[PDB]
């Protein structure tokens, strides 16, 4: 998208979201990142929404195909098509990880931006881990863990316990522990401690911030209800 103005790419990403054209939205935001300037808070959300929706559709398709393939293992076409979807998903995750490494993370100095990008890095390694097998699974799992852990360390030092990015990071790291790392007790402990420390800080918030924080706290509670 090298010939399109940065501001036009941002405008078109917002239009693509309204039109539910998430592949277009992600291509516009990739072009905006590749202009080389840092992203504002709103622009970071556009980037994350676009890729989360693209890879979320790929993950849902991979899960459908993987279930069919497992049932048939109780011609080569189901495996071949699952592999095609899997390769496409891996390619999108590699694209997002490449944007983060060249050069969003290294230029992000404020806590809000650095935590946001490291949470993304943990998420896209987690999506790679969902489809990985064997020893390659191990190194991919550790890369997700390391990204989430650095984000957690910064968030605990620099953000209040109700900050929505801090809360969403803790939510997704808890899902990592439960679904990827085979650590359900760590998942439950992290979700409970996060919820309780946020509850104790709600008194400091305005009505609008209260709504944002309580919405994510309810997601933590929904997981705790499913896990206990």
């Amino acid at each position: 998208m090298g010939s399109m103005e940065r501001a036009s790419l941002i405008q078109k990403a917002k239009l693509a979201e309204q039109a539910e054209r998430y592949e277009d939205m992600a291509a516009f935001m990739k072009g905006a990142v590749e202009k080389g300037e840092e992203l504002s808070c709103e622009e970071r959300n556009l980037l994350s929404v676009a890729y989360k929706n693209v890879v979320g559709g790929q993950r849902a398709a991979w899960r459908v195909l993987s279930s069919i393939e497992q049932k048939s293992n109780e011609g080569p076409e189901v495996r071949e098509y699952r592999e095609k979807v899997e390769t496409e998903l891996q390619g999108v995750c590699d694209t997002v990880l490449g944007l983060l490494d060249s050069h969003l993370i290294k230029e992000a100095g404020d806590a809000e931006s650095r935590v946001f990008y490291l949470k993304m890095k943990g998420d896209y390694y987690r999506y790679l881990a969902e489809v990985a097998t064997g020893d390659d699974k191990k190194r991919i799992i550790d890369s997700a863990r390391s990204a989430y852990q650095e984000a957690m360390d910064i968030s605990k030092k620099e953000m209040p316990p109700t900050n929505p990015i801090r809360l969403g990071l803790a939510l997704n790291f808890s899902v990592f522990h439960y679904e990827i790392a085979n650590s359900p007790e760590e998942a439950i402990s992290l979700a409970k401690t996060t919820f309780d420390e946020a509850m104790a800080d709600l008194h400091t918030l305005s009505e609008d911030s209260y709504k944002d924080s309580t919405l994510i706290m309810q997601l933590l509670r929904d997981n705790l209800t499913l896990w206990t």
Binding site: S48, V49, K52, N53, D123, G168, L171, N172, S174, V175, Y178, E179, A187, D212, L215, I216, L219, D222, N223, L226, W227
Partner: peptide, 8 residues
């Protein structure tokens, strides 16, 4: 188990 959605 659910992770965070993209938008509120």
């Amino acid at each position: 188990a659910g992770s965070i959605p993209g938008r509120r």
